[model samples]
Target: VSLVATLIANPAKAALAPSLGIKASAAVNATGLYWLADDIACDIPLPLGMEASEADASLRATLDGAPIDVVVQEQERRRKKILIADMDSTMIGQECIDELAEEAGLRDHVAAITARAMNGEIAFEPALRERVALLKGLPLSVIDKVISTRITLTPGGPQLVRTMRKHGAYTALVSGGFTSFTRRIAEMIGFNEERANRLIDDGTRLTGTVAEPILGREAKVEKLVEIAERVGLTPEDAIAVGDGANDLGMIQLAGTGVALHAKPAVAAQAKMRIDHGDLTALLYIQGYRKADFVQ
Candidate 1:
């Protein structure tokens, strides 16, 4: 059972000193050491007979309080064949519906619902309806404005998707968000496809109704299984990333499930959590060096 550990620091901060890497390798009785990126990401392969969980826990203790992410796993199939990423708060910095609520003059009210739904307090579908209903009379043009002015692509998102695609992985944006937003986001981020709930609207204004059946937690998992099978691969061949409760299903199912700056509930449940590092942390965990990045 060959095991490997990856330590990643935020690209902007670069907190991983070379001495820390040496210490990490020493702690794991590493057979060899490799730097995935300069003072940002490094890999240490462990000797046989060491349990990955024990190694991971020990490493975390050794590097206590460092603003870095540590991941340990089997070396085989480290690189995945597919990428399934959530949109709101994962690929992008803002939740689309929450931003739309601001334009609807219901930011406080709707944002509260969003926060709870994302944190797994309330049901996603009804909470989404409760939020969208308030935006009934908002002009359709506001959607474009919200996307342009309010929505921000998460740092390293484009690089993460493009690099995975460049290496032949299929990438898809699966969102509990709306199609209007996901379509644009996927295009901008270079995803192969996008799947999301649709917001029904009149010619000039919103109808405040989403098309059913809503693409929530369960739908996200189904999409993952469907996409992987369509490509003749299994769930174990994919990496899934998300930040909300609706994302938990897919996150748990994928080979590498990453909760990126996720809510407490999600972060607690996910197989991997990237709290400090940016999206490129996924690449580093997969053994991709900075030199392998496409853009």
Candidate 2:
């Protein structure tokens, strides 16, 4: 029944000061506090048999609106061996399709559709098709241009993948986005592999269609299971993160399911929610110090 509570501040804010950690830990009756990174991340070991749920609630109340995220869980197996992340908005800042639509001069229209699809208000497959349809006749070269000029890497993504891989963890970028994007993104971000849908195109322009068997929610869940088993692990040895509806299945299936700036429904259902911190928060929660980072 040993539990540990991790407190993480956004790197930009660096707000988990010792005094705040002390007060918050004492409020939950934790035995002691230790820093994973000075002023950014720390851990408090709760007294044996203490309920993590109650301790989490108490710690939040004690912190009183600090720009921080907290996760309380059993002390065992805090570090995971596998990482499965969503691509659009999870590893990268822009949704690839939405960015593509921007080239077609339909950014506003497509982004609205994307918002609903990501929020789980509409079916992802059909929404994607409708959005892709809008991009028909867009020159295939637009994909490369959009990638170079519009897509922004989510903060801490490279470090997150590199650090984990350095420590013998397997990492994969599994996206509901297109392979055209995922392949490049995976290479740049240093994931072990990538999985995603294929956007159909002729030699020079989009065909306004995606290949069959879209990799949506169910596919993501299956990919998590598949990757874990391939690595000789189970879902319980993996950490999954995402910010969209398609990500919820894998997020819920992993040992540490993180809703990283997720839509409301997904965030509410996740085991961990990173509202204030960036991707490095995952390392902090896994008991890794800043000194432990590979890059």
Candidate 3:
């Protein structure tokens, strides 16, 4: 397991060497990426005397409060063949459920629960049900209204999915959000497939309920496992990203688990955290140079 501390930044405005000021055994290029390779008895940071085992972690901590994204993983599996992503707040800029709640005149109320749920302050399914029940009797038409007016794709999302897929990878949007949003978002971003819980409606309005067997955190892990087996890939051949607590299961399970602008708790436990760059950070950290990106 030859691992390295992978660092990346927004290419258009990135300069690693100077920003890092890190004098260690390094392999960096003009592609806005650099590697702090562990071991080889040299390449030590100026002020820290760290052992080989803590080399990656020590340097990663040094980059805290900076835009240069960081993650530590094996050099052998730098690039992944499969991708699993969360939709809301990960691929997109808004939460579909909270946006729809805006139509139900409960945005503030429902969003509170959504926030707590995302932050791990409460269980996802119970929080989801509690929030949805507030939207009971909300017109079905609001779904389209919310999608049309409220949802916005996150920066660099299209390129992230397209670049990976163009290189023969399988991409799936396994969200805890609704199918209505997941289907559209997954298609819009060119994901190979999407999975999420369904919102049950009563012909004219929301029943304020989601169908049984909710696709929460554990379900996401199952999705990662199932998708990997379906495509004859392994979790070690995958990269997973999300911003909420429900996404932790898969994020923690993938070869590269990226907490993209994730909750404090989720980010704290992920294999990598992308606090500075957008979705493209995932690709950059995985060794995909900017020129290699699929637009």
Candidate 4:
């Protein structure tokens, strides 16, 4: 017999906890399996090589009978190890690059470049160079202004990092954005390490040039692997989250690739997605409970 399932919760709420186990259990209950626990969400597994069409039909019929809203995806048996996250949109509400652009009076122009780069319409390094060029000669103080006044943390970011740390899972901030912002945010959120492009400044003025061998999507993936290897863990023991096309490589390379409030293209391709919830939603996938948190 083939078993299939769906997760029934407010799509927004579902995004808050995008674990396969959680979603599956929701599907089971929606199909009238009320004996399942509130916390139990994975579905019973089917035999190998089940016909896709038949299995899907069975699941659909079962869901129709139970009447539950679900976001369908593959199911996994375990959680990941490392969490490689993007700093801008994934960890915070505003894109720091966009805000920095605004400080230089190039908000619209830079934002357009950001959107294209994120959506995969342009090569990340070149697009970044173009955007940075617009900010040429801007005062160095703008970096501080963007870091202190413009950036805001994403909901549940601190909680997520703390909880994951307690579980002994390492965290990293990998971004194509500037190092100045990434480093500060990593420190504030308790990340073990952070990597990003360094904005060059000629003493008093901005050079609009990034330091060599820019860290883009490829770098993010390489770093994820490097960290996993360093920690004595398999790549499958890692998690990656981001919101742009550039993130897809690292996200796919990790054990769990989650799209956090991502664009349509990214969300569709990612293995899992967190569309409405805080970074803490990651805790749910790891089987973490509120009581387990030290802080």
Top model by lDDT, which number? 1
Across 122-176, the per-residue lDDT of candidate 2 in tens digits comes to 9999999899899899998988899988888899899999999989999999998
Candidate 1, residues 34-63, lDDT tens digits: the string is 999998999999889999888879889888
Report RMSD for candidate 2. 0.9
* Model 1 regions more than 4 Å off: none
* lDDT per residue (tens digit) for residues 88-145 in model 4: 8888777877887897888998999898888888999999888888778989988887
For each candidate in the order shown, give its overall lDDT on alpha carbons: 0.92, 0.91, 0.77, 0.71
Model 3, global lDDT: 0.77
Cα displacement (Å) at residue 190, model 1 = 0.4
User: Clash number for every model?
Assistant: 0, 0, 2, 4
Task: Compose the digit string of candidate 3's lDDT tens values, residues 1-295.
Answer: 3444555665554545553634323332112223322110112222233333465555556655655655555556778999999999989999888898888788899898899999999999999889888889988888878887889999889998999998999999988889999998898899999999999998999998999988799999999999999999899899999999888889889988888887678788876787777787777667776667776
Of 3 and 4, the candidate ranking higher by TM-score: 3
Per-prediction TM-score, please? Answer: 0.98, 0.98, 0.87, 0.80
Candidate 1: pairs in clash: none
Give the lowest summed-lDDT range of ten residues in model 4. Answer: 33-42
For model 1, the local distance difference test gives: 0.92
Ten-residue region with minimum lDDT total, candidate 1 = 53-62
Q: For residue 221, what is the lDDT in candidate 4?
A: 86
Pairs of colliding residues, candidate 3: 24-43, 25-43
Q: Tell me, what's the RMSD of every candidate?
A: 0.9, 0.9, 5.0, 5.0
